[PDB]
Amino acid sequence: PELPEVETIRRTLLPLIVGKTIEDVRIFWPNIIRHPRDSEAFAARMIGQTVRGLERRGKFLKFLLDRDALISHLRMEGRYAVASALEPLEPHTHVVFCFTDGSELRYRDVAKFGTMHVYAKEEADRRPPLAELGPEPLSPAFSPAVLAERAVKTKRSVKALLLDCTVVAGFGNIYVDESLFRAGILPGRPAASLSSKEIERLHEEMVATIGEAVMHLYVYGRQGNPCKRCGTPIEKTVVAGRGTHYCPRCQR
DNA sequence: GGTAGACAAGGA
DNA sequence: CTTGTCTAC
Ligand SMILES: [Zn+2]
Structure with missing residues (x-):
């Protein structure tokens, strides 16, 4: 998606996830995880954090939580949807953030081109990929x-x-x-x-x-x-x- | 130090 | 083929 599509995602996704607490992160294509490099550390640190905001830089989405920022690029054709943990995953779902209320933030990407970086909030803007x-x-x-x-x-x-x-x-x-x-x-x-x-x-x-x-x-x-x-x-x-x-x- | 190509992939 | 950027020269 282009910048305007990403801003539309930013604006419509935010109410659907704000104030939700992460109980689990599940990863089915680890290469999407760029930082920390180990996907298990990426998952572990997210757990227990509540989503507080969603911002956009260029084509990057920045999910803001309690301590961390999640920097997400959809690249070619990544997509987010919020849906119930009770339903089967759509095809090409590579990352799922599970919330304590039984809903999920699901990331789908056929190309698997999309990326994810997690940093302490204060650090996000002075690190790859937001840095330059x-x-x-x-x-x-x-x-x-x-x-x-x-x-x-x-x-x-x-x-x-x-x-x-x-x-x-x-x-x-x-x-x-x-x-x-x-x-x-x-x-x-x-x-x-x-x-x-x-x-x-x-x-x-x-x-x-x-x-x-x-x-x-x-x-x-x-x-x-x-x-x-x-x-x-x-x-x-x-x-x-x-x-x-x-x-x-x-x-x- | 300044800028491309390299590089990520599953389907026509 | 089809895309975005940051790593590689
Ligand atoms: Zn003309």
Whole structure:
């Protein structure tokens, strides 16, 4: 899921788990557990803690408990659901947190790409994987100046810069293409080639694009089809990855 | 020290 | 194939 989907998960999962006490943690694919490295220590330390909150950083969910934070990335297709301990597990359930009220927080992930790190709360933000994360796109910390400062230090594509989690948190592929389109900038352009009016436009389209999604696509997945503004066939190439979609006329 | 590819996997 | 980032050069 993209940042807006994760924020939707954050918001809807929280009431379903807040104030619940962990009685057991069950793990069926231990590699999902990245810290502590031993999954039995991961399970043991969680037990007896009550869930107090749920926050989001980039595409990371941060479950806040009594002493610890659980940092969770869904990556490709992880999913959480709350359900009764009396029901059979859905397929591809790899981690289950059992609550004292007989309900469960279940983590499913067909790919098994998702990760989990548990640290003392105070430590979470200065450890992998939150440590080097860039500012939230929708916050004051992510500004034209911050974006300007990074662009002018590197020769790589403006798309590659924006996909860099240290520049800005959780800006997905779909939103990079869309934002660049709306700002009229080519995804393959060197970051250091952008004018200051250009970075200000990009910054402002980044915030609007991600901001509308949080609360109708122009280029993403639309290759071969008429651009919605000028009617020029949308084109698809490879930039910093990765499927890159753009209009050759609208974007410069 | 600055940046990709490497790397995690089960199904078309 | 299909994705996100942080470890590896
Ligand atoms: Zn166009």
